[PDB]
């Protein structure tokens, strides 16, 4: 029972840590994905501005 419970603590620590570290990497990537996509939305708007100058002449 001393072994069983020492192992259980090591087991659930290891899994609890792995779960958080993967959750964080999802979140940080999802944050940076949104930031770049809003910046790529600008480059598409700036392509409509430069087309509406040449398609008004």
């Amino acid at each position: 029972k001393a072994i069983e419970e020492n192992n259980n603590f090591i087991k659930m620590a290891k899994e609890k840590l792995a779960q958080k570290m993967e959750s964080n990497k999802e979140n940080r990537e999802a944050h940076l994905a949104a930031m770049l996509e809003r910046l790529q939305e600008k480059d598409k708007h700036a392509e409509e501005v430069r087309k509406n100058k040449e398609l008004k002449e």
Binding site: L32, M35, L39, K51, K53
Partner: protein, 421 residues
């Protein structure tokens, strides 16, 4: 995190940068060729933040000097520290902009922007550990206003995890009478709110009022305004430029100063334009604010204060507690210990004791409202839109820039009205 990459965009940006680089080269004991001639180790200990080490012990600014107008290239190269800059880092366009934001942002500046990014990339690739970027510019012009905010958004793409700071010069009818400057500032603010980590509101109205009423000059040139900006910019960079046990980089400072991502518009201040209690009262006084707003008309979310010169630190501790006690209502209760202080041994050239002030106050809305009033005077009657809709823009985007700035003001007000209980 040590190396910062400087960018000076437009006429305003290049001249305030020139003055910035003159003062700090002098402080670090660097002559216009670029050799160390000082005495103290402290001048070299964190030299790498602003200077690259070329062959033959040559210290060269990590500056990128950018404009759509030539001629500004000549004035900077002819000026007192023109020789010290890197020749390749000069990246100057052809036909200028002529106080037009849609030229700088969407068309004419967009053509030059890739040749700037090349110089940025070349500078950043050499950095052992790049921390961030600082942009000196005006928000009333065309190039620095528009191409500057494009550079911001473009640098964010290739460096999303570096800090982006701006010394953004706010336009004013008293200094410059160009009629469209309220359009340019409002469009810039729509970018800055989204794409910068902290923006220093260097305001031309306050600089005019200080130069007139304190420094005694009857009608001041741009050189008179810049002596104040270079003093501010020297002060707010002293943390990184000098030792002192402080161990902070652009991110630490931005973490401790910026409690909400959109609310990163600081109110600078300097003192004197002397004993420690006087300094401490002078810097918190509305007359010394380089942005034209009254702290007493709102509340401080956070404050940073840096002191320079030989002085008792016990006295500085007693005095910063003194004004916090005496002015308790003007600091939000729901962020404890939000007024922090550093002290620097080395004073600036000329003054034995100085004191620089950074303040994230909700009163900064008084600057954004003034611009919003000047803006809506012209917009509601559709004035001068042929300058902007000609170069390809839509009326929708003008409404978004007005709406985003009116939200920022509503948010600054929300937290001013917030209470602990």
């Amino acid at each position: 995190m040590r190396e910062i990459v400087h960018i000076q965009a437009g006429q305003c940006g290049n001249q305030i940068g020139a003055k910035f680089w003159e003062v700090i080269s002098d402080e670090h004991g660097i002559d216009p060729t670029g050799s160390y001639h000082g005495d103290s180790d402290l001048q070299l200990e964190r030299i790498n933040v602003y200077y690259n080490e070329a062959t033959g012990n040559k210290y060269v600014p990590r500056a990128i000097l950018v404009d759509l107008e030539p001629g500004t290239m000549d004035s900077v190269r002819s000026g007192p520290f023109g020789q010290i800059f890197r020749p390749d880092n000069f990246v100057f366009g052809q036909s200028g902009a002529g106080n037009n934001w849609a030229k700088g942002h969407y068309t004419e500046g967009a053509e030059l922007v890739d040749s700037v990014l090349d110089v940025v990339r070349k500078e950043s690739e050499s950095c052992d550990c790049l921390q961030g970027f600082q942009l000196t510019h005006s928000l009333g012009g065309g190039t620095g206003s528009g191409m500057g905010t494009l550079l911001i958004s473009k640098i964010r793409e290739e460096y999303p995890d570096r800090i982006m700071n701006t010394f953004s010069v706010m336009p004013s009818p008293k200094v410059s009478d160009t009629v469209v400057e309220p359009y340019n500032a409002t469009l810039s603010v729509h970018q800055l709110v989204e794409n910068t980590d902290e923006t220093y509101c260097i305001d031309n109205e306050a600089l005019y009022d200080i130069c007139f009423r304190t420094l005694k000059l009857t009608t001041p040139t741009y050189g008179d305004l810049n002596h104040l900006v270079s003093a501010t910019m020297s002060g707010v960079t002293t943390c990184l430029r000098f030792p002192g046990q402080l161990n902070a980089d652009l991110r630490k400072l931005a973490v401790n100063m910026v409690p909400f991502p959109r609310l990163h518009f600081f109110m600078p201040g300097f003192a004197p334009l002397l004993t420690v209690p006087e300094l401490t009262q002078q810097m918190f006084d509305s007359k010394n604010m380089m942005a034209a707003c009254d702290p007493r008309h709102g509340r401080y979310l956070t404050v940073a204060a840096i002191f320079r010169g030989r002085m008792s630190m016990k006295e500085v501790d007693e005095q910063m507690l003194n004004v916090q006690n005496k002015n308790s209502s003007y600091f939000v209760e729901w962020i404890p210990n939000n007024v922090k202080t550093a002290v620097c041994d080395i004073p600036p050239r000329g003054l034995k004791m100085s004191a620089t002030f950074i303040g994230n106050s909700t009163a900064i809305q008084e600057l954004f409202k003034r611009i919003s009033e000047q803006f809506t005077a012209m917009f509601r009657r559709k004035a001068f839109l042929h300058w902007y809709t000609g170069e390809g823009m839509d009326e929708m985007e003008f409404t978004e820039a007005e709406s985003n700035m009116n939200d920022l003001v509503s948010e600054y007000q929300q937290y001013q009205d917030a209470t602990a209980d």
